[PDB]
Amino acid sequence: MKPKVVLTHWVHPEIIELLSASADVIPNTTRETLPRSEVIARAKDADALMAFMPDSIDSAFLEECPKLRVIGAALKGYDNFDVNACTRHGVWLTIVPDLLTIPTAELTIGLLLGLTRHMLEGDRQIRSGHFQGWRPTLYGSGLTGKTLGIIGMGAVGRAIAQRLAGFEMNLLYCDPIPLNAEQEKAWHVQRVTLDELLEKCDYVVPMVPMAAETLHLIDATALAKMKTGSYLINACRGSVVDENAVIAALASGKLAGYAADVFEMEEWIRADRPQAIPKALLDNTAQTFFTPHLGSAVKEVRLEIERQAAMNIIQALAGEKPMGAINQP
Amino acid sequence: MKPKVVLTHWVHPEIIELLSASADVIPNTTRETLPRSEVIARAKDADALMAFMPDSIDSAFLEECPKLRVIGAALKGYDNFDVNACTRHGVWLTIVPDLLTIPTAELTIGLLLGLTRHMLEGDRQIRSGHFQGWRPTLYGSGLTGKTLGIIGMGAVGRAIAQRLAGFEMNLLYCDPIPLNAEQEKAWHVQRVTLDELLEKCDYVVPMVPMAAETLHLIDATALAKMKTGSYLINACRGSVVDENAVIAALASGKLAGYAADVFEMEEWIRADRPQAIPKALLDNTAQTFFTPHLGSAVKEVRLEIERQAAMNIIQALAGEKPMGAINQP
Ligand SMILES: NC(=O)c1ccc[n+]([C@H]2O[C@@H](COP(=O)(O)OP(=O)(O)OC[C@@H]3O[C@H](n4ccc(N)nc4=O)[C@H](O)[C@@H]3O)[C@@H](O)[C@H]2O)c1
Numbered sequence: 001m002k003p004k005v006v007l008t009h010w011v012h013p014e015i016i017e018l019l020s021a022s023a024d025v026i027p028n029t030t031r032e033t034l035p036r037s038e039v040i041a042r043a044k045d046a047d048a049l050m051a052f053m054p055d056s057i058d059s060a061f062l063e064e065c066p067k068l069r070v071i072g073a074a075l076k077g078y079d080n081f082d083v084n085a086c087t088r089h090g091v092w093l094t095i096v097p098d099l100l101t102i103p104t105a106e107l108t109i110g111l112l113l114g115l116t117r118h119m120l121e122g123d124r125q126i127r128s129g130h131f132q133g134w135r136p137t138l139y140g141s142g143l144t145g146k147t148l149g150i151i152g153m154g155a156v157g158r159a160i161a162q163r164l165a166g167f168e169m170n171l172l173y174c175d176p177i178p179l180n181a182e183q184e185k186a187w188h189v190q191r192v193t194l195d196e197l198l199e200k201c202d203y204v205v206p207m208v209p210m211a212a213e214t215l216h217l218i219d220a221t222a223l224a225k226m227k228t229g230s231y232l233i234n235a236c237r238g239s240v241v242d243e244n245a246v247i248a249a250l251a252s253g254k255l256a257g258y259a260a261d262v263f264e265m266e267e268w269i270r271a272d273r274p275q276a277i278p279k280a281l282l283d284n285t286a287q288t289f290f291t292p293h294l295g296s297a298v299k300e301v302r303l304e305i306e307r308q309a310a311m312n313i314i315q316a317l318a319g320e321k322p323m324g325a326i327n328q329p
Numbered sequence: 330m331k332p333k334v335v336l337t338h339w340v341h342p343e344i345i346e347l348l349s350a351s352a353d354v355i356p357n358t359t360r361e362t363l364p365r366s367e368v369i370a371r372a373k374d375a376d377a378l379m380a381f382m383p384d385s386i387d388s389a390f391l392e393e394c395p396k397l398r399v400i401g402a403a404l405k406g407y408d409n410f411d412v413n414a415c416t417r418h419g420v421w422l423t424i425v426p427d428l429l430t431i432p433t434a435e436l437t438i439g440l441l442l443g444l445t446r447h448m449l450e451g452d453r454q455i456r457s458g459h460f461q462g463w464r465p466t467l468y469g470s471g472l473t474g475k476t477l478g479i480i481g482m483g484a485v486g487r488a489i490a491q492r493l494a495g496f497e498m499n500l501l502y503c504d505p506i507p508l509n510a511e512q513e514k515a516w517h518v519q520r521v522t523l524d525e526l527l528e529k530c531d532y533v534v535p536m537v538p539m540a541a542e543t544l545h546l547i548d549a550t551a552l553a554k555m556k557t558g559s560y561l562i563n564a565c566r567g568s569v570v571d572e573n574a575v576i577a578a579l580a581s582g583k584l585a586g587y588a589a590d591v592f593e594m595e596e597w598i599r600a601d602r603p604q605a606i607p608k609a610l611l612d613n614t615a616q617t618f619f620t621p622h623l624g625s626a627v628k629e630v631r632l633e634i635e636r637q638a639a640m641n642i643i644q645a646l647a648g649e650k651p652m653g654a655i656n657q658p
Contacts, residue, residue: 307655324540
């Protein structure tokens with residue numbers, strides 16, 4: 001009998017066919033997240049699982065699935081997995097590197113341009129049917145000559161700087177790890193401290209990992225150091241920005257706008273956590289621009305992420321050591 | 330008429346004999362890489378292609394080979410292939426299992442010993458004809474009693490630690506995921522943070538698994554934390570080490586030497602890659618030891634890689650789903 005593989009979320013039909021040669025596949029045929037109780041029910045006698053961001057693989061999950069030999073995570077960050085529990089239960093845990101970086105950088109620049117040029121309200125004005133030509137409205141803020149700061153010059157930060165290098169801006173970054181001289185010259189980016197960054201920037205773009213030290217890194221104290229009329233673009237992680245302080249800074253005029261691909265509400269791991277995006281942000285269509293965690297939502301990229309997770313499962317089930325393993329069961 | 334298979338690079342004669350049973354084989358009789366135009370000229374009417382590291386398969390290539398049914402990559406990865414273009418053109422794309430671990434670990438230790446014991450300069454002095462017996466020269470650094478640190482503890486790192494376990498060294502490692510307690514005791518290897526590792530090590534060996542690769546893990550900041558007089562050995566991947574930072578550390582005396590099997594000029598997916606090994610490294614024969622990507626240049630391993638690629642081609646040409654498929658055409 002073939003091993004069984006459960007996929008918790010929708011995958012491209014080619015991926016199901018690929019896995020079907022060596023396993024019986026139980027897919028999620030909908031675009032929705034199944035409740036944890038239904039994922040566990042399907043996985044209880046599975047040999048393999050393809051896991052996604054909404055899955056929380058803890059010891060209780062693994063105890064319900066005694067046949068599991070590999071979890072192929074279609075993800076880079078494995079915060080939602082208990083790796084040591086996987087290891088103790090004899091379960092390979094694999095991830096996918098690199099693939100999310102560039103589409104997230106591209107989306108961040110889209111949020112920057114959409115927010116600073118009032119493009120959403122512009123589209124709404126077009127859809128109203130009342131367009132009759134140019135009007136002296138929706139005057140925004142341009143990029144050339146402005147100062148943009150990247151907090152965290154890592155994979156996404158470097159992808160963003162490379163792309164903004166052609167926009168004739170003044171680019172700053174802060175990071176405990178500096179770029180080298182060739183990189184700083186290539187992108188014309190200057191290293192500063194976080195305080196200097198917050199002081200000088202028209203646009204602030206946090207791209208740090210979520211850690212104890214970066215929880216609410218952009219809080220009321222950071223916003224108070226920022227330039228009046230500045231913009232904040234958040235596509236890193238939901239709780240790096242204090243959304244209640246942002247609401248206050250928009251109300252007072254400290255921030256001219258806020259754009260975000262990520263939200264505190266999706267950080268289910270923290271106890272003090274809201275279950276909805278604050279209404280004062282949702283109602284403020286004039287000053288905000290939001291996307292539902294679309295950072296890596298590019299069809300060709302999602303397919304290659306799914307392919308890497310599938311190959312890890314195939315390799316593990318064949319008795320090989322999977323290419324993306326982070327543990328050793 | 331049998332189908333035709335084009336092999337872009339040299340293979341062992343028994344592989345050509347294996348393929349000859351079901352296909353007419355067009356080999357590369359030389360040890361050279363053919364220009365792309367010649368590969369296309371051979372493969373325009375081929376049913377199958379065996380591809381290697383120097384190959385790159387894009388949509389334009391596939392448009393010129395309308396009879397192609399399978400590309401069997403003699404590779405454990407597929408960065409140089411447009412997988413979805415293969416799929417859309419009806420072409421199977423296959424890979425082989427990762428067979429590189431142990432020969433890479435062995436070569437890394439060869440690099441360590443050759444570099445630290447001045448063996449290349451020693452051989453030069455022998456061939457100069459002027460050897461007249463022992464002299465107080467070419468004094469190097471030994472292994473016993475010294476501290477060596479492996480950054481990353483996946484398959485290759487574990488192979489290195491197992492082999493260095495008998496050398497009476499102080500072995501350290503860092504990895505987000507720890508080794509088993511039985512392995513730590515068996516190899517006498519101790520987990521430390523990266524900072525502790527860089528601080529304590531006479532020898533530093535970056536060997537991060539594919540899931541943990543990051544650009545310039547060893548940069549100017551890391552090198553400034555290392556011990557003065559230390560040695561750096563890179564058989565991992567070119568992008569792991571900032572080669573211009575290394576040149577500066579050799580020049581300053583921070584590094585006593587650098588050995589490498591891989592080079593930044595090899596990173597054809599990174600936009601800002603170089604196209605030569607820096608002249609300041611090539612000239613420095615006194616403090617460097619280099620090999621041209623030989624980590625798995627072992628006859629047994631190369632043969633098995635070719636054999637698996639040939640079997641995939643044979644399977645696909647016979648109308649089966651090949652065992653190493655990564656797509657579904
Ligand atoms: N919206 C999405 O769908 C999406 C997609 C992918 C990723 N993400 C997010 O998940 C994270 C991973 O981003 P990353 O760039 O891949 O992570 P990393 O390379 O480790 O970060 C650079 C680091 O910054 C550090 N650092 C640390 C502390 C400090 N006080 N200052 C620092 O500066 C340190 O030195 C290093 O350079 C965010 O970046 C963000 O992108 C979202």
